[PDB]
Design an enzyme around this catalytic site. Structure first.
Site, PDB file in Angstrom:
ATOM      1  CE  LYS B  10      20.054 -31.857 -16.989  1.00  0.00           C
ATOM      2  NZ  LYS B  10      21.499 -32.188 -16.789  1.00  0.00           N
ATOM      3  CB  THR B  57      20.772 -33.602 -13.201  1.00  0.00           C
ATOM      4  OG1 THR B  57      21.862 -33.429 -14.107  1.00  0.00           O
ATOM      5  CG2 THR B  57      21.344 -33.482 -11.794  1.00  0.00           C
ATOM      6  CG  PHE B 159       3.793   8.059   0.186  1.00  0.00           C
ATOM      7  CD1 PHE B 159       3.150   7.028   0.884  1.00  0.00           C
ATOM      8  CD2 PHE B 159       5.081   8.324   0.528  1.00  0.00           C
ATOM      9  CE1 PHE B 159       3.786   6.326   1.867  1.00  0.00           C
ATOM     10  CE2 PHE B 159       5.729   7.629   1.528  1.00  0.00           C
ATOM     11  CZ  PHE B 159       5.077   6.617   2.220  1.00  0.00           C
ATOM     12  NE  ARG B 176       2.833   7.603  -4.567  1.00  0.00           N
ATOM     13  CZ  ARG B 176       3.587   6.930  -3.729  1.00  0.00           C
ATOM     14  NH1 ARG B 176       4.783   7.305  -3.346  1.00  0.00           N
ATOM     15  NH2 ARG B 176       3.117   5.779  -3.232  1.00  0.00           N
ATOM     16  CD  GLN B 228       3.955   0.694   2.476  1.00  0.00           C
ATOM     17  OE1 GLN B 228       3.502   1.319   1.531  1.00  0.00           O
ATOM     18  NE2 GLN B 228       5.148   0.913   3.004  1.00  0.00           N
ATOM     19  CG  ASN B 254       6.623   3.312  -5.499  1.00  0.00           C
ATOM     20  OD1 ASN B 254       6.386   3.685  -6.625  1.00  0.00           O
ATOM     21  ND2 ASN B 254       6.155   4.012  -4.499  1.00  0.00           N
ATOM     22  CG  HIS B 256      10.625   5.877  -7.037  1.00  0.00           C
ATOM     23  ND1 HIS B 256       9.571   5.820  -6.164  1.00  0.00           N
ATOM     24  CD2 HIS B 256      11.617   5.217  -6.413  1.00  0.00           C
ATOM     25  CE1 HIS B 256       9.933   5.160  -5.061  1.00  0.00           C
ATOM     26  NE2 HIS B 256      11.193   4.765  -5.170  1.00  0.00           N
TER      27      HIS B 256
END
Ligand code: NA
Ligand code: NA
Ligand code: NA
Ligand code: NA
EC number: 1.7.3.3
Lengths: 295, 295, 295, 295
Positions: B10, B57, B159, B176, B228, B254, B256
């Site tokens: 269930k 169930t 980055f 950023r 990362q 990420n 953006h």
């Protein structure tokens, strides 16, 4: 055939803005979703393929960003009023601008007990919204609201004394769960234009704060006779605290939590005074609405 | 043909529980969504219409509620372990129980600066989850997680230095926005059974608290070289702080936020150092994952 | 600490492609959502801020579009294999590419009984999907699936003979509604590389067609003893009809339709043989799974 | 304070009904989601905790099911009118009933070229809806609609000749994709009561069929000058074909498909006449509305 009504524009325009204080290093962010729909002498774009009267929705989008660049985006009542004013002033043949703004929460993080200068958390999907209708020769009509405010109280809700006939199975109760998603709207007195909206700018954040405070405290403290009676108390208080509001609207679902009778299993007592485990119901739900104005 | 694998049960079982302190009047609520899927000697229900081996169930559902009635539902690692243990002990032919629990937030309201005894707010859609796999003769495997933790930082993300070839258009950046929805999982050492899980009960809430704290502080304070590198730092710290965890997994989008060049309009400067208004992108999004274990 | 596993890339990459026949004027469209996650010698991007090993997710996005421009996007098994092959061949240090594709329906419109050359309708949210894992030195593993196929039968479902104990309240039935959302997956024999995938291209559309046909006909015609027994019949048939498939997986919710006893109202008979009006239940739901392979 | 407006009831009431032909064995199913909100002399439930005037929303729910048991649920215009009539006739102090119905598709399966007697498929999330306002002494106002009809055409959409000023960046085009989700509403002449609605019953299914047919054919065949001009053509035709409709409303998003310039990569030509691969945009979107009435 003839066009009876027409409005068009750009919806779902996501906007972020940052303010950076060069002195302190403290950054503040704002995020919204914007819709602008225009009305005016545009009927020929529908009836005669006359695109000359169309301010392109892509240009409307550009204008939203440019307006956010050149003006404060807070309070959203002000931003919406600047934006709608722009369209009706810029374009002779546009006579109304309808601006809807959903503000998303970005609350500053506290790290090790201290506010962080540039890090934020979305503490809920609760929104602060405006609907700003800028109509040439009719000023600016603003409805402000909070929505998606989800609450629950585990006692001090009752529901008894309701009409009982051959369609009724609901048992009266003197102690139940009450949970809702609050949608609360306060409708401002008409403003004559942007100047009048500007004259009231501090009242916008303050009245959103009052509405939120009143909602939460009244929900928490009212030993509720019904959703109807509790929400009315909320609306009366907001009207008493801001004379520039004409009406307050609430729309509240009753998100049911059902008792579960388990006595079929080893005589387990889980109802009434012994009710501990409940089944939240996704649907159906009560839906209770009212608009409260001044007597 | 033959059955290679089979599990059934269930899903989407919504559960609320309240605790009422008779002394103080303070009520505490818990709300979850539960899935239980069973494995065992059930292949004949698929291949020979033999329903005799099926624990219905609907009965699984009943059992979830009965178990919540008779046991603590917190921490969810414990509740899940009690629930899965029940099925494999009760039914000779059931040899594994897979219990997934999503815990929904109900945070006590503060009214006029003081905690309210029975009123709660959903402060976000952030979830605390468990996956508890109870396997006969193989103990109890628990993965704990937090999910839906949405954050943004407005600077101190970078980055640059990534691989550049004929498929690359992305400009390097030294400043950023970084925004994500955190999904973080900590995988416990195998437990031999329910007794061992019980022996560690306080560590479950404490390790969820550590994981959340570490995530938020590392996000806020790391001048991130990449998603990362930031998420790895989070995982290393959690492993250092709880030796009963074997691995930590992060899955981070990420989300953006794109700069908007407005220089085509009156030479407006909204890029680089002058970037103030951005367009949040709903899709696509980076998706960064890692599983960190002990060296 | 050490990285035990890591994969990263771009998710939610929406892609449309059109084919235009210059002769006939017939256009054909394809729309998908793509995720590509890469694995390889990338651990230093997590542990040492070494972005040099990162193929930027933005570049992954670009590559998806470029690959769609230069190659067929149908069948999605082929497109996914070309795409994953590209990454592991192009980048010495990338050793696996995991490609997930969701295909959205755009079915040609029939206007006045005749197919339209460039107009399409989304006839349901039913998806055709692939998961293509391209692993250097381990070939190409493909799982194909259909999902979101929502069906209901109003009789010729039964459920009786299941285990009954002190947790059981469900009444046995010899006639019930059965409704589900079909998620069905067929796992192909490992392919050694792109050439082998190409050698089988026609089998991909044909096997999706068979799986869909078998699902619908078996659902419609089986007087179902249980979801377990019906779905097994589906999987056996698909395996019999395509020897290049190794296993078939089904995941089926049992979306409950509850009888409503109305006898409390004017002795209205709405149960059993008189059952006409039912309450569809949003949750909970049974969830039944199996993986069927070759004996 | 005073109540200016108030309505309350039950939302999200899921309803299934089956018809079984005992002769042929052919079963036909209907599934809807229903909302009923009542108005009347109920203000004291808000202002004075007077629940005596409350027809419980749970009783409203019961009444929906009982009404579906004792009456046809198709066409939904009729069902809604019977349901709303019931409340205002049954309860002296209830003076309006607002009934919203969403009808879900269950299309009979064709198995091996022949219609199956009791098996159905959801061929899309496209809905057929009604809003039925039953107001004591003001008859029955019905708005019928189709929604969630998602379409795309790959050419024969244009957009040029629109206003160009300092906010405009959009390039004129003579060949673009056009995709939308159609929301189309036809507003019936006021009906005096249930008898008049009954007198027109066949027109409800026929006018939904016409509206759908006209939408699809006009979308497919109009070499569209704009969304405005195409949707107007749809509305004019529907008005010409059913004189009992007073107005037709369309609300259409322009779901953008953007060209992707790939010339930076090996001089790949993917724009203009060479445009083959596009990026569907989730947001923002144009939003175009009009209400067309009789000249
Ligand atoms: Na104007
Ligand atoms: Na067992
Ligand atoms: Na490689
Ligand atoms: Na009445």
């Amino acid at each position: 055939s003839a066009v009876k009504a027409a409005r068009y524009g750009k919806d779902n325009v996501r906007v972020y803005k940052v303010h950076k204080d060069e002195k302190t290093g403290v950054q503040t962010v704002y995020e919204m979703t914007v819709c602008v729909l225009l009305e005016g002498e545009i009927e020929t774009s529908y009836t005669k393929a006359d695109n000359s009267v169309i301010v392109a929705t892509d240009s409307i989008k550009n204008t939203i960003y440019i307006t956010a660049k050149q003006n404060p985006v807070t309070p959203p009542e002000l931003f919406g009023s600047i934006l709608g004013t722009h369209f009706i002033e810029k374009y002779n043949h546009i006579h109304a601008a309808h601006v809807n703004i959903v503000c998303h929460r970005w609350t500053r993080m506290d790290i090790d007990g201290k506010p962080h200068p540039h890090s934020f958390i979305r503490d809920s999907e609760e929104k602060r919204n405006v609907q700003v209708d800028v109509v040439e020769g009719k000023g600016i009509d603003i409805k402000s609201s909070l929505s998606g405010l989800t609450v629950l109280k585990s006692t001090n809700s009752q529901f008894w004394g309701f009409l009982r006939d051959e369609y009724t199975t609901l048992k009266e109760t003197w102690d139940r769960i009450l949970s809702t998603d609050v949608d609360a709207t306060w409708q401002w007195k008409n403003f004559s234009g942007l100047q009048e909206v500007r004259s009231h700018v501090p009242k916008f954040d303050a009245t959103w704060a009052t509405a939120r405070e009143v909602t939460l405290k009244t929900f928490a403290e009212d030993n509720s006779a019904s959703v109807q009676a509790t929400m009315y108390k909320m609306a009366e208080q907001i009207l008493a605290r801001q004379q520039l509001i004409e009406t307050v609207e609430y729309s509240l679902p009753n998100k049911h939590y059902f008792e579960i009778d388990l006595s079929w299993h080893k005589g387990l007592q889980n109802t009434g005074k012994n009710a501990e485990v409940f089944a939240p119901q996704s649907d159906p739900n009560g839906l209770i609405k009212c608009t409260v104005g001044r007597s």
